[PDB]
Write a protein that binds this ligand. Sequence first.
Ligand SMILES: C[C@]12CCC(=O)C[C@H]1CC[C@@H]1[C@@H]2CC[C@]2(C)[C@@H](O)CC[C@@H]12
Length: 247
Amino acid sequence: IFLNVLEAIEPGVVCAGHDNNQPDSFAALLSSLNELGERQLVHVVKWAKALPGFRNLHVDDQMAVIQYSWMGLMVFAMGWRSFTNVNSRMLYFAPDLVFNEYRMHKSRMYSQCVRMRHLSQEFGWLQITPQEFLCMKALLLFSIIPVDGLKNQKFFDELRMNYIKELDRIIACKRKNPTSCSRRFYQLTKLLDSVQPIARELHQFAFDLLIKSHMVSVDFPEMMAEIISVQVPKILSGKVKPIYFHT
Ligand SMILES: C[C@]12CCC(=O)C[C@H]1CC[C@@H]1[C@@H]2CC[C@]2(C)[C@@H](O)CC[C@@H]12
């Protein structure tokens, strides 16, 4: 039943509304990414809330969890769109916002894009399964919290453990078998850990851009400006940190 839900609640295609007739300018690319950000945020919020056992979390923790994991969730899904649609050649942000080397450099985000392209490849280098992808993605929502804990840390802990057990079950139940029930787990949890450092580089980047955003003609939609100035700082200042499997 768990896999039915994830498959059933998987959001669809989200376009960024990017004008591809216009030249690839830093402000153009980042504004489109920003807008894409506002657009996917809406979806992620509706996805997370329809997640199994999500309502078991306290109200502001439901929101907290979302406002802290959104960067990680979106990159992971983006990495995945890149794998299916284009074999991780280029980064598939949206059908109308595909980044190539030029764009990557022409976004002043080259290095970060290398890491994400690198992630998309892992989906291939490991032959990651659509069912594993979904579970992994779900687990990402419960992978970053305040060091002083949430309102009801207990419920969150119950919720996080169960999701881990599921990622473990779709690695055991008949389908691909292989006693590799361990090697496969070490690797996925290893892949899961790797989205975090990538998400941090983007967190810092989004932040600096926002501070001097109007100095570079870069528009930040409402929701995005709020979360980057209110929630991301807590991550960057160390108040909220990611949960790592390996450490
Ligand atoms: C989450 C988004 C938007 C949704 C997506 O598919 C990928 C992705 C990764 C880069 C983020 C971007 C939103 C806008 C940000 C945060 C920019 O300010 C700098 C990095 C961008």
